[PDB]
Write a protein that binds this ligand. Structure first.
Ligand code: GNP
Ligand code: CA
Ligand code: CA
Ligand code: MG
Ligand code: MG
Length: 166
């Protein structure tokens, strides 16, 4: 069956782990344990196709930036996550995209831009700003909440559907 290698990237604390765990395990992780690098796999049906999701949950703490080249080489599609209440995290997206672009020697890498924590009211990144950023990369923008499950399946499934367009 078809296997899709997804890699979840973004700054510390934006909710990469919570998003992934909500998707695979269907619960919300409230506590904050910084990730080094974890792998998750789950067989799922997407648009009638039975497939395997191979998801790499990566480190947002910059001390581990050295590991980025390895996973960027392996991954087929990248979920670029920021938090809507964390401007700096949104600004950090460009540094992730650039490295992906270098490593893949491509600017048609399957990606989805994700604005997570859309359940919180402390918004400093407005939807339209993120929409504009994603437009410049030629990718979708999707808002999520790992807490309420809003948009979680759509984000990852859209990433799959982007890999398929390539
Ligand atoms: N309200 C709310 N809190 C969230 C959401 N996603 C994550 N959080 C909270 O934000 C904190 C950090 O989440 P986490 O998933 O660990 O972030 P991370 O990006 O995986 N961190 P790291 O890069 O260090 O591995 C946790 O306390 C988590 O509960 C969300 O959608 N809504
Ligand atoms: Ca919990
Ligand atoms: Ca692109
Ligand atoms: Mg994490
Ligand atoms: Mg503003």
């Amino acid at each position: 069956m078809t296997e899709y290698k997804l890699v979840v990237v973004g700054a510390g604390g934006v909710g990469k782990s919570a998003l992934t765990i909500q998707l695979i395990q269907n619960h919300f992780v409230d506590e904050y344990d910084p990730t080094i690098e974890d792998s998750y796999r789950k067989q799922v049906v997407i648009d009638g196709e039975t497939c395997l999701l191979d998801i790499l949950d990566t480190a947002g703490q910059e001390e581990y930036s050295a590991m980025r080249d390895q996973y960027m080489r392996t991954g087929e599609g990248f979920l670029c996550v920021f938090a809507i209440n964390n401007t700096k995290s949104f600004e950090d997206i460009h540094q992730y995209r650039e490295q992906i672009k270098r490593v893949k020697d491509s600017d048609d890498v399957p990606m989805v831009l994700v604005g997570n924590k859309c359940d919180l009211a402390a918004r400093t990144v407005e939807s339209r700003q993120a929409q504009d950023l994603a437009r410049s990369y030629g990718i979708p923008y999707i808002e999520t909440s790992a807490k309420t499950r809003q948009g979680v399946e759509d984000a990852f499934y859209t990433l799959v559907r982007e890999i398929r367009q390539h």
